[PDB]
Design a protein around this ligand. Structure first.
Ligand SMILES: Cc1cc2nc3c(=O)[nH]c(=O)nc-3n(C[C@H](O)[C@H](O)[C@H](O)COP(=O)(O)O)c2cc1C
Ligand SMILES: Cc1cc2nc3c(=O)[nH]c(=O)nc-3n(C[C@H](O)[C@H](O)[C@H](O)COP(=O)(O)O)c2cc1C
Lengths: 313, 313
C-alpha cells in the first residue's frame, strides 16, 4: 500500500499540497513547505510588481471555516521566478508557480519570462482566473469570452503545459460551457477546482459589526462551509474533461475529506483554511488517516478508487 | 414588548414564516402552518398542472444542513388558488402564494387568474426565478435578459404589487446588474434572498455513493453551510434597492441568526431546513430567543436595528 503517484512527467510521494496563498509568500514560507511531509508545494499568486494588499483586518477564522479579502499581497514576479530558478531543491518535491495578473497583458508579460525557466527546471504553471477580492475586478472565469481570450493569449505566449485555477459554479449550463472552453486548449493539462466561494459576509452578533475591513466586509469563504460545493465542481469537470487531470481544493480537514475528493476525480488534493489554522504538521496526519481508510477498504493504490463515486440506479 | 410589525398594507404578529416548499404542499400542511406561532405562511411553488417531481430519494439532512432535488412536486395551481380564495382564515395571519412556471407563458397564465383573488382577498404573490432542480432548466435569474422578460410580462398581466425569490450571487458586478434590473419595475415591492445554493454534491464515505438519486446526485444546499452567503445577498440588495423591502432566507436556526438577518436588512425572516428538521414548534423558540437578545441590548422595536450593521472605518 502506498500514496505514490506520477503525473505531468513528475514523481510525487503523496497527493497532498498547500492551496495557493497559504504558507507560500516569503522565502521562509517556501522553505517551511519544502521541509514538510507534503508531496508538492505552490507559490503565492503573483503580479508584475510587489503589492501590499488590502487593509487589516483581512482574514478571520471560525469553527466552520474562514473569510478573507487579502488583495493579492505578494513579493512580485521577479522574486518567485528567482526562487524557482536558483533556490528551490527539486530533489525534495515538485514546485508549482501561481500567477494572477490584473489584465491579459500582465499575464502574457510574466509567461514570456517564465518559459525558459520552466523548460530548464520543470517548474509547473498554475494560472489564476478566479480571484474574488480585488476591488473593481470580477472573477475572470465568470465571463466566458474573457476566459477564452486569456487562454488563447497565454497558450500562444507560453507554449508549454500549464494548469488553470477555477472559481466555483452553481449552474449545470455554466459547468457545460466552461469545460467546453477548456477543452479547446491542448496545453491546459490540469484544472484546479475550486477557489474561494466569493463575496460572503460574516457579522459578529455582540459588536453588531462585520469582521473584515475591505469591501464593506465582503470576502471569499473557505473550509467546512464549502465542501459539497468543491466536490460538485471536482466531479463536474472530471466528467466533462476526460483527457485532462483535475486537482481538488476546498473543505479538506481529514483523510476522509481527501478520500471523498479522490472518489469525485481528484489527482492532487490541496489544503487551505485547515493548513492556515493547524500548521504544516497537518500533512503527516492527512497521510496517516488516508492510508487507514485505504487499508480498511482493501485499496492498495490511488488508481483503484479515483473517479469511482457511485450514482443511484 | 411584542414583535408585531406592518408591511405591504398587512399586519404581522412577528417577522417569522416558513421558506417556500417546507411544510406547505397539502391542505394539511397549510392548516398546520396556520395553527403555528409564525407571523405568516407561504405555499409550495406551483405549476399550471399537478407534478409528481423527481425520483426518490430526493432530500437528505446532515449536521451542517441539507441537500435536495425535489423537482417542483405540487398539487397544481388550481388547488393553491382555491386554498387562497375559499379556505384560508385571513384573521389568523397573512398568506403568500408562490408560483414557479417552466416558461414565461406559464407564469402569465397563472397571474391572470390570481389577480381577481389578490384584489378580493389580499393574498400576496412570490414569483420564483431561482429553482435549481428541474433537468434542462437553468436558474432564470442567472440569465439577465430572461429575467427582464419575465418581469415585464408578469407586471403587465398582473398589474398588482408582488415579490421575487432570488438565487444567490457571488460577484459584485452580478449584484450591480441584478439590482438594476429589479429597480426597473415599480410593482416589485419585496425581494427574497436567497433560494438554495445550487448544484452541490454530498457523498457518503462508507458506501462510496452520492446520497440523492436525481441529476447524478447534484442538488441545492441549505442550512448551516449557507448563512454567510445568505447574509451577503440580503445586505447587497438592501443597499442597492433602497425603495423596496428585502426578506431574508438561509441558515436560520436561532433567534441570534434572525438578529443577524435583520441587522443586514431583512424585514421578514424565512425558515427552511431548520423547520423541516425540528417541526413547527421552532417558531415559539425563535420568538423567545429574539426577544431576549433585544432586551439585553436595549432595543424596543425591530426598526431600531434593521439594516444597521456596522462596517470598519
Ligand atoms: C489567506 C488566503 C489567501 C489565498 N490566496 C490565494 C491566492 O494567492 N491564489 C489562489 O488561487 N487562491 C488563494 N486562496 C484560495 C485558496 O487557494 C483555496 O482555493 C480556498 O481557500 C478554498 O480551500 P479551503 O477550503 O481549503 O480553504 C487563498 C485563500 C486564503 C484563505
Ligand atoms: C424540501 C425543500 C423544498 C423547497 N421548495 C422550494 C420551493 O417550492 N420554492 C422555493 O422558492 N424554494 C424552495 N426551497 C428553498 C427554500 O425556500 C430556501 O430558499 C432554502 O432552503 C434556503 O433556506 P434554509 O437554509 O433555511 O434551508 C425548498 C427547499 C427545500 C429544503
Amino acid at each position: 500500500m502506498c500514496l505514490k503517484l506520477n503525473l505531468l512527467d513528475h514523481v510525487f510521494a503523496n497527493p497532498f499540497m498547500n492551496a495557493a496563498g497559504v504558507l507560500c509568500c516569503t522565502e521562509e514560507d517556501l522553505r517551511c513547505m519544502t521541509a514538510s511531509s507534503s508531496g508538492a508545494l505552490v507559490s503565492k499568486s503573483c503580479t508584475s510588481a510587489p503589492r501590499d494588499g488590502n487593509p487589516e483586518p483581512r482574514y478571520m477564522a471560525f469553527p466552520l471555516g474562514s473569510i478573507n479579502s487579502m488583495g493579492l499581497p505578494n513579493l512580485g514576479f521577479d522574486f518567485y521566478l528567482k526562487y524557482a530558478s536558483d533556490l528551490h531543491d527539486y530533489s525534495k518535491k515538485p514546485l508549482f508557480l501561481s500567477i494572477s495578473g490584473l489584465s491579459v497583458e500582465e499575464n502574457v508579460a510574466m509567461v514570456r519570462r517564465l518559459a525558459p525557466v520552466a523548460q530548464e527546471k520543470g517548474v509547473l504553471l498554475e494560472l489564476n482566473l478566479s480571484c474574488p477580492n480585488v476591488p473593481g475586478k470580477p472573477q475572470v472565469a465568470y465571463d466566458f469570452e474573457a476566459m477564452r481570450t486569456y487562454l488563447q493569449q497565454v497558450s500562444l505566449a507560453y507554449g508549454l503545459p500549464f494548469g488553470v485555477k477555477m472559481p466555483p459554479y452553481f449552474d449545470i449550463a455554466h459547468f457545460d460551457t466552461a469545460a467546453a472552453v477548456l477543452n479547446e486548449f491542448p496545453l491546459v493539462k490540469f484544472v484546479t477546482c475550486v477557489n474561494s466561494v466569493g463575496n460572503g459576509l460574516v457579522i459578529d452578533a455582540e459588536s453588531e459589526s462585520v469582521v473584515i475591513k475591505p469591501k464593506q466586509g465582503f470576502g471569499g469563504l473557505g473550509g467546512k462551509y464549502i465542501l459539497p460545493t468543491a466536490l460538485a465542481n471536482v466531479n463536474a469537470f472530471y466528467r466533462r474533461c476526460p483527457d485532462k487531470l483535475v486537482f481538488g481544493c476546498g473543505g479538506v480537514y481529514s483523510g476522509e475529506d481527501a478520500f471523498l475528493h479522490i472518489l469525485a476525480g481528484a489527482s492532487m488534493v490541496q489544503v487551505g483554511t485547515a493548513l492556515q489554522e493547524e500548521g504544516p504538521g497537518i500533512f503527516t496526519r492527512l497521510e496517516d488517516e488516508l492510508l487507514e481508510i485505504m487499508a480498511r477498504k482493501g485499496y492498495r493504490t490511488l488508481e483503484e478508487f479515483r473517479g469511482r463515486v457511485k450514482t443511484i440506479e
